[PDB]
Amino acid sequence: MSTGDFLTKGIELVQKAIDLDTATQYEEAYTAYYNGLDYLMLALKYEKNPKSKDLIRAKFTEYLNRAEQLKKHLESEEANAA
């Protein structure tokens, strides 16, 4: 119930997401990234220090953008094939 604990859970999930992302399993990375984002969101809800909140927020944004990149690539992929 501590943002440290959500944070850990989030970071854990985001690490798996990255491994998958690096391994080109984008559909699974996508889900993983988004699981991670749920935790980071909880973490920043339970955190009260505005500099720490800002830090978590900045990382949240970077993983959100990565996720959407993979999502575009992934639709555009078949759309180029199909």
């Binding site: 119930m1 501590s2 943002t3 440290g4 944070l7 850990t8 970071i11 985001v14 690490q15 990255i18 992302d21 690096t22 339970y46 955190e47 009260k48 220090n49 500099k51 720490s52 800002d54 830090l55 978590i56 990382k59 970077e62 993983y63 953008n65 990565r66």
Partner: peptide, 22 residues
């Protein structure tokens, strides 16, 4: 009410954010 006030210097110690691929 179970909030934290976390010292960011320490947040950045006790939790290291992995980066995304290029």
């Amino acid at each position: 009410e179970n909030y934290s006030n976390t010292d960011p210097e320490e947040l950045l110690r006790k939790h290291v954010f992995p980066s995304v691929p290029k």
